[PDB]
Structures are given as structure tokens and as C-alpha cells.
A paper describes a structure:
Next, we analyzed flagellar filaments from the Gram-negative bacterium [name] to compare with a Gram-negative species. Since the D0 and D1 domains of [name] and S. enterica share a high degree of sequence identity (55%), we tested the conserved L- and R-type mutations characterized in S. enterica (G426A and A449V, respectively), which correspond to G420A and [name] in [name], respectively. These two sites (E115G and N240) are mostly conserved among different bacterial species, and we also detected the same interaction in the R-type [name] mutant in [name].
There are three parts to the flagellar structure: the trans-membrane basal body that functions as the motor, the connecting rod and hook, and the flagellar filament that acts like a helical propeller.
Author numbering:
A (entry chain M): 392 to 440
B (entry chain W): 50 to 169, 385 to 440
C (entry chain g): 99 to 147
D (entry chain K): 50 to 147
E (entry chain A): 148 to 169
F (entry chain A), G (entry chain J), H (entry chain V): 5 to 49
I (entry chain A), J (entry chain J), K (entry chain L): 441 to 488
Amino acid sequence: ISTADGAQNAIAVVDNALAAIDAQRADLGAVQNRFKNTIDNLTNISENA
Amino acid sequence: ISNRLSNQISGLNVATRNANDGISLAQTAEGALQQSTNILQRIRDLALQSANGSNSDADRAALQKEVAAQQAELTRISDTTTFGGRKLLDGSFGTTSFQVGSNAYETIDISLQNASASAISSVASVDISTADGAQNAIAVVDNALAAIDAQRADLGAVQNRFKNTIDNLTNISENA
Amino acid sequence: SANGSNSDADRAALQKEVAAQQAELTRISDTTTFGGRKLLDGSFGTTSF
Amino acid sequence: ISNRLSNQISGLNVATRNANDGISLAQTAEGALQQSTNILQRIRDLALQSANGSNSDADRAALQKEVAAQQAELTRISDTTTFGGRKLLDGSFGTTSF
Amino acid sequence: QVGSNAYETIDISLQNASASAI
Amino acid sequence: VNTNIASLNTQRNLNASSNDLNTSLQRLTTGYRINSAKDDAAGLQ
Amino acid sequence: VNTNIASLNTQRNLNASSNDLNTSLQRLTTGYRINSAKDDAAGLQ
Amino acid sequence: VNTNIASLNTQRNLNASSNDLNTSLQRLTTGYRINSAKDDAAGLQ
Amino acid sequence: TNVRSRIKDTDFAAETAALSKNQVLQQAGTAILAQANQLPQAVLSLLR
Amino acid sequence: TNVRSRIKDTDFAAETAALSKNQVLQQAGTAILAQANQLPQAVLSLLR
Amino acid sequence: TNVRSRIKDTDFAAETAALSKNQVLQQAGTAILAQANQLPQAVLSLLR
């Protein structure tokens, strides 16, 4: 960071960059929902079998 | 009369088995469509989250990514229902028949929805990110979601038809 | 359906249930083949015992 | 007498359902008209704020703008009450039966 | 949007500009 | 008399009542008349 | 009858409800609907 | 009965009253009925 | 939520009545079969 | 902070309703299984 | 405001009486059904 010109450009870096973390955490959260729904159908196929 | 009659009784027993297997099959279809239903409700909710003019376009893209995940799940529920290996409702199911008596062609035809993933135009088509797509999306999933439930209606009625059929069936058995 | 608050779309859904039940009436009407000369659908000829 | 009677009982149960749905419908109408009521009270209040001869004509125009906003809200409460998609009270409701 | 149906929304009309246009 | 047609009927009405109880419990667990399709269109639609 | 398919269903709906309670407590401890990914994108993003 | 529609109503009227208190405190801190737009045109204009 | 309540929920005061009924019908039917499966034992009391 | 509040927080008046519901569902399901695991004991009351 | 008070408000000393009454009626009715749903169990004590 130490230079001011790097202080602002830094914020551009971590701004476009931080949202990739959260893009993943989004995806994985959805994948956990996909799991839960999958299981909810799964135990039904189990019971019906 | 006892040979023919006994053969009839046996056919009736086998029909109890087959009708009950049908109830269980249509049960599987019901549950899978409960999950696709909950999903497509969710997709509607995200379209409503996007219609918020204050929700920035970047986060609208994030919503779209969640939607796409949910859509992949619709493709999965669409698959994975392999009762017997000739699975329920994705792609092409051939509108089979379930016999419920002892005579040939004395069956219940059932009409599972040909597809779920791409054909509820498509749910997967929509790509919410733009506001003009947020509202039109709701039109899509509104006319579209009620086809799922039109089926779940039909099949629920078919399960009632099964139960009534069986209730008469065991009477014909007892009378024979 | 006579519930004025029940929307016309859901009235159509009710109608679909009804139609299913009607197909079941056609089935109970059939399927009663005592002897192959079944009971009550179509034309039964008023037999004697 | 048991078949007819049972059919009657079932109809009575369905009637409990339908009447209660009617209570809930008329409830929705009530609430929407609570909000339109509060608004039209408010519009009255602004007319009373305007009758103040000391209130300048420019600020009377400002009051009018608030009123117009409230009027758009009356159009919105008028809409948006889609119970079933055949909504309550705006435009033409056809005097149904329960 | 303030309901559940499409186009059931409140349009809002923020002033296009503040700096040079008041 | 081998068939013993009193038991047979009793078996029937027993399995019917037992289907009704199995469902009744299903209605009590989640506390919903509606848990699947076999109820109705008025159930879900 | 060994399978006893009333209990089986009850076991299911019990474990589902119990997952809902386990999460519900998780929402109450920190006092947040959001505590991890499994909620949503609307949760975090 | 799961829905428990007495609590639901109570939750509503509670959050409405609580909005009224939150604002009421906002009116007391600065000691002004007017602190933002949500009051009125008669408030500010 | 009122409407969905009257559709989708169960009033348990009705349910428990249905349970008590069904339980009585099962315990009954069982105890009935205790007799129906013993009426054929009246046979071999006759001529054996 | 208003926006993040409506996203990330929980209104506890809703939570406690969800708790009361879930607790009833568990205590119920337990007490149900007390019966489901005793219906097979009607068997050996019949023929043993 | 006096008139609107007597119309629109509730005097809570009346309300709490209505509550105590209703609560007693519910807890009662529940505990009653504990018996009404057990009177049919007197059946299978008879002939089973």
C-alpha cells in the first residue's frame, strides 16, 4: 500500500477481487441448498422403494 | 367356474400389487416435484429481488448465478428419479399403463410430464440480470410453475383413482 | 367452485380434478366383469335368477 | 338417508371453508380501505392546510403535489389486491356469491 | 416492486442532477 | 368351511383402517392434512 | 408388516423438523438468519 | 394448527408499534417531529 | 396465511379423534381375528 | 445498516414461533413413535 | 377523543377477564378430549 497512488488502486484490486470470494461463497451456499433438496427427494425415493 | 374364478382372484391380487406400486411411483413423482416446486418458487423470489430498482446490477448478476445453480438442480431432480431405470418425468416418458384388474387392457394410463428441466419459455432461459427480464421472468415462471402443479394435481387425483379402484378390487376378490 | 373468491384459474384446476374423477366413474362403470358379462355399464339385459 | 345425509355433511364442511375464505377476503378489503381511508383523511388535512389564507399559493401548489402522490397511492391500493387474480374493488368487480 | 405480480411496482423519479442543474 | 369368510372380511377392514391410521399419523407428524398428492387438487392447487 | 411404515415416515419428518430446529437455534444464538452459506445468495451477496 | 394465527398477528402489531417507537425516539432525540422525508410535505415544504 | 391454514394444516382436535377411532378399529379387528381363526376349531370337536 | 439489518438479522418474534412449532413437531413425533413401535405388538395378541 | 375512546379502545380490565375465561375454556376442552377420546377404549374391555 505504502504509496497513495497504490492506496486507491489497491481499493480497485480488492474491490473486483473480494467479490470473487463471495461469488464462490454464493455458489457453494446454493450448492448446499441443492444438497438439501436432493436429500429431501432422496429419502422419499428410499421410503417409496 | 372354480378354475376361471380362481385365476380371476389371483389376477386381482396381482392388481392390488400393481396399483400400490403405482401409488408409490406417483408418490416419487410428487416428491420430486415438491422439490422442483420449492426451487421454482425460489427462482420467482429472486426475480422479485432483482425487480428492486435499488438492487445494483452487479448483485443482480449474483442473483442470476444463484438462479443458475437452482436451474442445475432442476436438471438434477429432472434426472435421478430412476424408478426401475426408466425414470419418471425428464426427457421422454412414454405414458405407460398400469393394470388394475385381471383382463387385458384393463389399465390406468398415466401422463407424467414429458420434461421438467428445460420445458416448464424455459425456466433456464431467463437470465434475470436485467430488470426488463426480472418482470417478464415472473410472467414466465407464473404461467410455467402452474404446469408442475397441474401435473401434481392430476397425479394426486390418479392416486385417489388408484385407492378407489383398490377398494372395489378387494371386494371383487372377496365376492369371487 | 361456487366460492366467488375462488379464482377462475383454480376453478379450471378443480375442473381437471373433476375430469379425473369422471374417468374413474367410467372405470368403475367398466371393470365389474362378473363372468365377462359385467354388471351395470352400457347395457345389462335384466337377467333372472 | 345416510348417503344423502353424508353428502349434506360434506357440503357443510366445504361451506365452512368457503365462508371462512369469505371472511379473509372481506378482511383484505377492510385493510386496503383502512389505508385508502388514512390517505383520504390525509388529503382532507391538506385541504385544510390550504384553506389557511396565510399559506402562500406556491406552498399550496406544493401541498397539491403531495395530494397527487397520495392519489397515485389510492390508485395503487385500488389495484394490488389480487386475491386470486380477480382483484377486489377497483374497476369492475362483478358482485360474486359465496 | 411491492407485490408479487410483474409490473406491480413503484416508479421513483429522483432528480436527474444536483450540481449544475438546480 | 376352510376359507373362513369372516376373517377374510376382517382382514380387509383391518388393512383399510390401518391405511387410514398410517395416513393419520402422517397428518399428525408434520401437522398438515396435506403431505403429498394422494389427498386432492383442493389440497394443493 | 415388519417394516412398520408409519414409524419410518415419522422418523423422516422428525429428522427434517429437527434439522429445522437445529438451524433455528443457530439463528437465535447469534441472532442472525445468516450464519453460513446454506441459506442463500440473497443471504450474503 | 401449526401456523398459530394469534402469534402471527401479534408479531405484526408488535413490529408496527415498534416502528412507531423507533420513530418516536427519533422525534425525541433531536426534539423535532421532522427529521426526514417520511413525515410529509407539510413537514418540510 | 389464513386461507393456506385452512387448506394445508390439520386441526389436531379432529386428528386425535380420527386416531382414537382407527386405533379402536385395529385393536378390535385383531381381537376379532382371535375368534375368526378359532371358529374352524369347532370343527374337530365334531367327529374329529 | 438498515439494509444489512433486514438481510442478515433475524426478527426474534418470528424465530420463537419457528421454535415453538419445531418443538411441538419433535415432541409430537417422539410420542407418535411410542405408538408406531407398539402397533406391531398387536400381532402377537393374534395367534401368537 | 372521549367518544372515540369509548368506541375504539378496549378497557383492559374487561379484556383480561375475557382472556382468563377463554384460556380456561381451552385448557378445559383439551383436557375433556383426553377423556372423550378414551371412552371408546372402554369398548375393547368388553368382548374385545
